[PDB]
Amino acid sequence: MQVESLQNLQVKIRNDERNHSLTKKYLTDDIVKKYQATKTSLGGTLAQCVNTNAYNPGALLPRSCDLNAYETFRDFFDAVIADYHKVPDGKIQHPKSNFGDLKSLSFTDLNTYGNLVVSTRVRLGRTVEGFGFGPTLTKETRIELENKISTALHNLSGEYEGTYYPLTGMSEEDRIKLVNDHFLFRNDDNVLRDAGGYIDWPTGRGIFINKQKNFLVWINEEDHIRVISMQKGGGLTAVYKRLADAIQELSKSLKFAFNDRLGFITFCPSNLGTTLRASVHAKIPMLASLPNFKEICEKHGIQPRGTHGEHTESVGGIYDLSNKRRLGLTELDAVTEMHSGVRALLELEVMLQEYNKGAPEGVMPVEPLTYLAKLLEGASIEKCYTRKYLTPEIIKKYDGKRTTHGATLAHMIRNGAYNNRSICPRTGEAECYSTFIDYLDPLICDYHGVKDSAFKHPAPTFGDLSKLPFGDLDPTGKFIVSTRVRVGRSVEGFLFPTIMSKTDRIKLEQVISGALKGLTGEHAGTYYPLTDMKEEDRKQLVEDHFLFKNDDPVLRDAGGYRDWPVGRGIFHNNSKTFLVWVCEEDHMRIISMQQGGNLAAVYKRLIEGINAIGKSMKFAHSDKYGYITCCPSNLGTSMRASVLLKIPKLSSQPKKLDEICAKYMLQARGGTYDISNKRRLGLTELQAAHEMAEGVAKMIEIEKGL
Numbered sequence: 169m170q171v172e173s174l175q176n177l178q179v180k181i182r183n184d185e186r187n188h189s190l191t192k193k194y195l196t197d198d199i200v201k202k203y204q205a206t207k208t209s210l211g212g213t214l215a216q217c218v219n220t221n222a223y224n225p226g227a228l229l230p231r232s233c234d235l236n237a238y239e240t241f242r243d244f245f246d247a248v249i250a251d252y253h254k255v256p257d258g259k260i261q262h263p264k265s266n267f268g269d270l271k272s273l274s275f276t277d278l279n280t281y282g283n284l285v286v287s288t289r290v291r292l293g294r295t296v297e298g299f300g301f302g303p304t305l306t307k308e309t310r311i312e313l314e315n316k317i318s319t320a321l322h323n324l325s326g327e328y329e330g331t332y333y334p335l336t337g338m339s340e341e342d343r344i345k346l347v348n349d350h351f352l353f354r355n356d357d358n359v360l361r362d363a364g365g366y367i368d369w370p371t372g373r374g375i376f377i378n379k380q381k382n383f384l385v386w387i388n389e390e391d392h393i394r395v396i397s398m399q400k401g402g403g404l405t406a407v408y409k410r411l412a413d414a415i416q417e418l419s420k421s422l423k424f425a426f427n428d429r430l431g432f433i434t435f436c437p438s439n440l441g442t443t444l445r446a447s448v449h450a451k452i453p454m455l456a457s458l459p460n461f462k463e464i465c466e467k468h469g470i471q472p473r474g475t476h477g478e479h480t481e482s483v484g485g486i487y488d489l490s491n492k493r494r495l496g497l498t499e500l501d502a503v504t505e506m507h508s509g510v511r512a513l514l515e516l517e518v519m520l521q522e523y524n525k526g527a528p529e530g531v532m533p534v535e536p537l538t539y540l541a542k543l544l545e546g547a548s549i550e551k552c553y554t555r556k557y558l559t560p561e562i563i564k565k566y567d568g569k570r571t572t573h574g575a576t577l578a579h580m581i582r583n584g585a586y587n588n589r590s591i592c593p594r595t596g597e598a599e600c601y602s603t604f605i606d607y608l609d610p611l612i613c614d615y616h617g618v619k620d621s622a623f624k625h626p627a628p629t630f631g632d633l634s635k636l637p638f639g640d641l642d643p644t645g646k647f648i649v650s651t652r653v654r655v656g657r658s659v660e661g662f663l664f665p666t667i668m669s670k671t672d673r674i675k676l677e678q679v680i681s682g683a684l685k686g687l688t689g690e691h692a693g694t695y696y697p698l699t700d701m702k703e704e705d706r707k708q709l710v711e712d713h714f715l716f717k718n719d720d721p722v723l724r725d726a727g728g729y730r731d732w733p734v735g736r737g738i739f740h741n742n743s744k745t746f747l748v749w750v751c752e753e754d755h756m757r758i759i760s761m762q763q764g765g766n767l768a769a770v771y772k773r774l775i776e777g778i779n780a781i782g783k784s785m786k787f788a789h790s791d792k793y794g795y796i797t798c799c800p801s802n803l804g805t806s807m808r809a810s811v812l813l814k815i816p817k818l819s820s821q822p823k824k825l826d827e828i829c830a831k832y833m834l835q836a837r838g839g840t841y842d843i844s845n846k847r848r849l850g851l852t853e854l855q856a857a858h859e860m861a862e863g864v865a866k867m868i869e870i871e872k873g874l
């Protein structure tokens with residue numbers, strides 16, 4: 169196989185913005201310098217290994233010119249392998265092959281868990297010693313290898329008796345039939361093509377099928393041998409035993425390449441070690457729809473792959489689920505990982521299907537409350553409010569209860585269940601604060617340091633916007649880089665961004681954007697829908713650090729990025745001093761900000777904007793808690809006023825710093841600090857903003873003191 173110089177290929181791979189391969193990561197100048205003239209014992213080069221990466225930027229891994237590539241270019245491949253297979257300290261190792269005690273081995277049938285499994289399949293691969301891969305084979309040696317292998321296959325007994333079909337000479341009718349039965353491989357993978365996989369096509373290649381059509385062998389498709397056992401249903405035990413028996417028998421005839429670092433050598437580094445991929449095709453539509461579906465699988469040792477194109481338009485939810493591990497465990501370990509993980513996932517699909525019977529369409533499905541309560545046990549019952557008030561009696565009372573529009577207690581603890589450092593829940597709608605009052609009210613009281621009162625929450629008390637008790641906290645040069653006040657708001661009648669449906673989001677966005685497009689004067693601006701945005705607008709939003717990404721795991725697992733990015737957007741005025749985020753965590757975050765320390769002007773602009781928006785919709789409001797928001801941490805005023813404060817001196821006596829913050833009820837985050845009022849509930853908007861001002865005024869006058 170003739171390919172470009174390694175240095176050329178490196179430049180191509182590096183200059184390609186679409187390429188994010190591990191090949192790109194580890195094919196360094198030093199690596200090129202070391203290996204650009206080196207040949208394996210079969211005469212292969214590193215250029216031949218990385219060639220496909222130069223032309224296929226989507227490819228993650230190199231391939232190998234022959235089995236000696238891993239040793240010959242070890243500094244490169246060990247780095248790639250350690251990275252891909254997540255090998256701890258680059259301490260790559262692999263145990264001797266062990267399929268287990270076949271006579272006594274037994275796994276439960278996977279269809280026990282809801283009868284969701286269409287089929288079960290286990291695959292392995294082998295390299296025959298003494299022969300190269302695609303780039304280093306000759307036409308003759310590939311055929312010699314094929315002959316060696318078909319002869320070994322012809323010698324399998326009973327169960328494995330069947331027919332060898334060489335590709336060469338195969339009629340097009342047989343070709344059509346065999347690909348229709350999914351027994352035949354084709355030359356249709358460009359990554360494989362550019363790694364030398366189809367040289368001298370179709371010679372030296374073929375397939376073998378037994379009479380029962382549950383055992384299938386590919387010769388020289390990519391690896392020397394790929395062996396596949398398969399059948400309808402969930403009989404993993406039989407599939408795996410059938411596979412194990414055959415390869416053990418074949419081993420008596422063929423010498424397979426193995427070393428105690430990588431295990432069984434394969435053409436692609438992803439399939440080293442056991443080479444084993446045990447899998448099922450399963451119907452798991454509800455599980456597949458969870459926001460952290462992928463993470464859930466990985467945590468159970470499972471890798472999911474979509475099967476789109478393989479089924480009808482109205483039947484998706486069918487996935488391939490396999491062991492995620494190949495290297496660093498035995499075959500028995502790997503199929504056990506598969507069985508255990510898949511069993512857990514199918515049991516979870518069954519639980520989802522049952523717990524969400526009757527729930528509104530488009531509303532986020534949720535795991536059973538008691539399941540999530542177990543995951544939440546990893547949270548500190550001392551710092552995590554979500555767990556602290558989730559008592560046995562609360563679980564018993566509220567399990568299986570829904571609000572009128574479908575919100576559950578399970579919904580609201582989910583973010584904590586899957587992110588144990590998260591300390592507050594995320595509610596599903598305003599009604600949550602009465603339907604689940606026994607959970608939420610003590611939690612709220614605890615978080616905000618308050619207690620049950622006979623009196624209605626104070627009405628919105630914004631103050632006289634022409635005679636405010638604060639002005640410019642820093643007229644002079646700089647203690648204050650910038651000032652900001654924001655509030656959260658929920659719109660009456662809508663489920664919150666956690667669980668709301670796609671149609672809900674679309675309607676919400678029509679209500680809110682309609683109001684925003686009508687704002688005038690200082691508040692006049694432009695709405696930028698995340699769905700229909702001009703790219704230059706998109707770039708500029710990112711430039712200004714006006715971000716709205718689906719990248720927070722806490723929000724994600726509460727469901728806040730579902731049906732992305734429909735109904736989401738950013739509004740701001742031309743000056744970028746008044747902005748609204750639409751449907752992130754709350755229906756709205758309404759924000760006023762500007763350079764300098766003029767809090768009175770930021771506050772005034774904010775209040776006038778809230779009022780203007782409020783003309784077109786009713787804000788969710790509570791006699792108990794004031795303005796209602798998704799997170800209970802942001803009730804009452806839902807107001808956060810803040811400054812970007814430069815205090816080089818005081819930040820270096822940091823506990824007469826963290827003591828002001830304490831006694832003036834401020835929060836600080838990093839001599840430049842972001843300082844904000846900590847209180848939200850139990851005070852008026854005016855007091856909230858005044859507390860920040862008084863606290864910041866103290867800090868500043870403390871600062872000049874040093």
Ligand SMILES: NC(=[NH2+])NCCC[C@H](N)C(=O)O
Nearest residue numbers: 226227228229230436438439
């Ligand atoms: N046997 C194989 N086809 N291996 C290819 C695995 C794909 C690989 N992770 C890549 O993107 O390079």
